[PDB]
Ligand binder design. Structure first.
Ligand SMILES: [Ca+2]
Ligand SMILES: [Ca+2]
Ligand SMILES: [Ca+2]
Ligand SMILES: [Ca+2]
Ligand SMILES: [Ca+2]
Ligand SMILES: [Ca+2]
Ligand SMILES: [Ca+2]
Ligand SMILES: [Ca+2]
Lengths: 219, 221, 221, 221, 220, 220, 219, 221
């Protein structure tokens, strides 16, 4: 059984598409989309957005189990992500695109959800990212490292207010985000503050991207 | 030793200044505070919905919308159960008052208004919304599209849509295929390029405009 | 002042037109609307069961039958809990009124009627049905067979039968080995080739005929 | 030490007699028994639905229909979760075989069949039914009307109708405004005067005819 | 005007012992009970009756909170109801027992309360309190139980490593284990198993299951 | 490599009867059981043991599903586990009994299964199936029970208007009522009560409670 | 029915002790101890401590429904408190005593739990206190006004950490308390910081009182 | 392939630096990280308990203590279920390591250690603690008093005391009448005037002294 998608590369499949991996165990699979093309491939994608159809302003439960279609926009589920990061060391890549036909990305050498936590729930699925290699976009996620995942159901952020509610999304919020890749799909520039799909360092807080996907690969 | 269950009684009690007041919709055991608009169109308005600051988030669950949530001073939602108790024992009239970011006001009135009327159990009937004859104010008629629909949240999908229209609209309402009025949407503060997710009154400012103030008022028959 | 808990109270309040009314069986906290037959045999009837249109499906679960379900206007079931509160604090008389598809009317009266009488908890006792002295109307005596039997649903099989008599009969009732009266059966609208699964009153039109209209009425002593 | 997860594997194992067999859709830890129709049209059919006696009641809850219920020997339902595990990891073909009380047989085939395909969580997506190209057998095409609809029960109403079409129909199905096929309805054994609540295939025997036998079969692509 | 206990019913003007409605919660909902208006001046509210052995008292923590049975025959009034009475008035206890040899016995306790002066009965586990004991035919078993939370196979509150409620086939305010198991299995006479029947230790020991049993309550 | 039953343990190379770990669900979680590697060639998995009388078997439906007790002494393996074994292999039944007069007896049944060919054991109530019976000392009581769901005072599945599980002081696949109640109350010898102890009707009748009892399972 | 204890004064009872009042309604009472002696009496007590036996490091549910014995130490319950303050205007008095045979107190004219809130739960049962009349002790509660009630179950405080956990108690915490009348009963001076029954303005953060009770009376 | 279920296996795998490691007590499906003391007395210690900073609160519920809670790096509790999985399949030795605020160290060793040994279900048996032969280190023998006692929390009281000793002690432990060792008490940081509520080892520093560091280690037989 392949638990990640780098295993699937070894299985003998290299066309990027929907695939079944067994992160828990052989009992139940979960379908994911894999980017076998970008930078040698072997990417497991836990986050996809482009159409704007699927709303990512969901509750803590949907974000734990995952939600959406492996074909189009989806969120793999925080629990699944924890099972992968728990048993193997992983690398992060996020790939972004605006409405001006420009692409950008940012890479982080290490990436883990609640690393070395006896229970991910108790630890709030903390996000950890280490060494950052710069692509097109800047470094927004390093600001978020060490923060529990927050939703309008469960406020874990360091802000007196509910930053997840104010930002129209879910993320590992601090005082408030520099990256809200689950914000509301406002499709271009917006006059509201830091509530759309925003990567602060690339296009600021008042610009909502067109496409967004966060990729994961073995060490 | 006599209790006012609605706010039109408070008018009869002898109080006409609009403000916070205690009314007993359940019974003399426990009251619930509300804000009353004793000024607009003769007064006697019981308000079950207020929004203006945008601070309070209305993307809440089915339980919060059943029991009610917020501050009677500022933004709040009275609670679906309370609303059902009032409309169950008296016939009521609806008025909604709206305001945009261009210093313009509008409204719409509905002669009859009830939540799940003559329903032996509101839960089983899903707290259906009923509105009848519509008298035009500044805004158009959006709510008549919603009459007969159960109240839906991201917890409980009652809408007629394959998707969860409450989830797509970032709010709670008596949804059909999807709303013409989402007065519990996200407070996006002005125009927005996203589709039908803010505090939107379709017939007045369309689906791509988020209002500034919003309040839904109720008075005896 | 005291609240009217039954509909004979409402007669004393000064209302004699049969229609939807609010009575407070639990307490002043929450009412439940019911339809009252102020016309039949002097009136003052509280109706805990209505069927005629066939629209509402009565093949529901134990929870819907405990809390009640339907519209006080048309077809509905008041809910066993409410029924227990009435019979617990007052002595009541039963009348069931029936009509077939041949423009014929019939009825049956039972002097005493109670749900789980002298039971410290109605749930534990399964809301046992008790009916006493029977005065003959158009129909025969089918309910006397059912007295002493817990209320059974496809959720909760309480009947004395090895099978699920509630499931085989497409309804809910105080079943024994199996019913002679299934006034919550499936609305099969006339004659049917299936056995004892429609709205059936055995002694009047047998097990292979489903009535058109049905309502079970309750009045003070 | 090698496990057959579907029943086309069992054909490859070296077994071709139609009967009860163990397959491992989840994994080698726990199997789930199913009946396989290795005779019809080349065989290799995995059956997730059987009805004929009418004894087993299919008016069950969302939980019973998620985990599955019944006997692989006689009437049963394999379970929505299991069905989702198979369709998730392989592409499958659908065949439903029907029989009336007049000694007639019919069927309908669909090239593609999947429950909530490519869904990261079946619960969130409501276990939608998808069927593609339809090859006609004896019966017409009722299921294409149902494609894209979440599975609904009287516990969980997902249909596009204001009412609870699962409750009105006395069964569970991927309901829309309401079904053209209710293969989990009440086994009324022949014709019925009530509307669209029995085991009905609309295009073959209409809404007022309840089949005698029913079974839904699945094979690899 | 509503009678909340059965000594009120004496004042209402009813003295024939039978099933009656009292309002311990409030005028909203009554709960029926059987009252023994005959024994020792009357005014007894009965929260426990057993005689046929038909009703099984091996029930869960929830049934014992809300109560179960028929006020006519065997029943249990319910721990919540009992706490409502003992919370608002001071009460006296009497238990009346009978064996299979046509003998009667009893025991009286001056004070009786369930979790007295407790802001929430659930949190305190509905502790039993009994004070000064006046001897009748039977001995004093309940004084051993005073201060103990009510235990069932659902909720083990006893002081024993094992589940004394499970071993005793009943429910009671168990300590290390009972001297009185008035909710045990109705084994109807002698039994070779240990301390699992309707047993009053001080009257007929641990290997004797009574025939009839009822626990009565009256105002102070 | 993991042994799911105890005939696997026989092949592992262990033949001394005692507590062993087997993995009926899967390699994730084991459950310990006692194996009778002595009787009739051995390889017996024991899902039921009684002798001391200490452990009470008048338990709820949840305890009987998940199992309860110590694999050393008296215990019940748990119906869920029992269902996983019978689901994936065909099994043979043997029950071994002993009274208080130093006499032994037994009964064997060729086929034995819990909820066979059931897509979910819960829905089917964990029905008992037993086929061909080879006579030992005791008679055939279980054939009366074949096809009956498992019943407890929590869940009455029996064919009786009353609650046969409650009247019998135990849990079993009851019909109108049992001829074998091997989970009854440990009444330790003769008893004047009717059919509420550990009783095998065909060997020592309804008024005699055995001393030792254990129900064994082996591969086909 | 008397819903408060000033009604009980009118009922005709003036000896301070355990009494039943009906704050919800005639359906269910809740016992309280009333101080009919202090400053004319008519005090309803929602808080008592002296023996130290009852532990006040409890959960949010125990503090909503209440816990303890009306005889000795107890907590009336936040919900009950809300029913009183919702329908009548009330005055606050807290009475304190150290281990040196000294007494002190502080009075606040207005006192309310979640005033004008359609649901107390949603508002977290905010504490409001207005004009303060000085007794022996200083003014610690004015710092707490406007803060939701917090427990180790539910962190509502404005502090990044869980101030309820650090203080060994439950209170309407801000950055952290000046008054922790539900702290751990450390019985005198303690070297730990602000975790005992502490009234900051009277005996500082390193002194745990001996007796404590918070009293309420009609307007 | 080849998975280490304990940390003595990790010694054989070839890792001897004390730190966080993955071991598979359930199975190869899901690991759980633990910290191992490969240094003390030859190493191979699996640590199910660590405390030193005082930051993590151990006044948690029965569910958190069943599933485990904390960070394997710093303070944590491995979880009662995992502990039962280890002790169920192998025989283990116990060592507890203690340190005060006076730069002194102590410990106590127990030859046998088990959670609910030979229990068909840990829940039913309440996860009883068993410890046998005791070898004296710096500290005395407090745990022998606790052997045979179920694990108790303020959620679930299993102790032999009329009160809730877990609640009075501000921690969780296998309580009897009350503890001689409360290694999950509140981190009061030194001496305290309250009775038996801090991280206390009675026989070493009594009931009025709260330790600075605490960790309970486990090794194969
Ligand atoms: Ca926050
Ligand atoms: Ca929908
Ligand atoms: Ca039955
Ligand atoms: Ca619907
Ligand atoms: Ca115990
Ligand atoms: Ca039965
Ligand atoms: Ca905080
Ligand atoms: Ca205790």
């Amino acid at each position: 059984q392949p638990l990640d998608c780098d295993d699937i590369y070894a299985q003998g499949y290299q066309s990027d598409g929907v695939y079944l991996i067994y992160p828990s165990g052989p009992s139940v699979p979960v379908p994911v989309f894999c980017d076998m093309t970008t930078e040698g491939g072997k990417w497991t994608v836990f986050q996809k957005r482009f159409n704007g159809s699927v709303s990512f302003f969901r509750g803590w439960n949907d974000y734990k189990l995952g939600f959406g279609r492996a074909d189009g926009e989806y969120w793999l589920g925080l629990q699944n992500m924890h099972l992968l990061t728990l048993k193997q060391k992983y690398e992060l890549r996020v790939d972004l695109e605006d409405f001006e036909n420009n692409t950008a990305y940012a890479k982080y050498a290490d990436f883990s959800i609640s690393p070395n936590a006896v229970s991910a729930e108790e630890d709030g699925y903390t996000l950890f990212v280490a060494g950052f290699e710069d692509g097109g976009a800047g470094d927004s996620l390093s600001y978020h490292s060490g923060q529990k995942f927050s939703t309008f159901d469960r406020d874990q952020d360091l802000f007196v207010q509910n930053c997840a509610a104010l930002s129209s999304g879910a993320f590992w919020f601090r005082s408030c985000h520099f990256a809200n890749l689950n914000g509301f799909y406002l499709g271009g520039s917006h006059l509201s503050y830091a509530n759309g799909i925003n990567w602060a360092q690339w296009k600021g807080f008042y610009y909502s991207l067109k496409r967004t996907e966060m990729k994961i690969r073995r060490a």
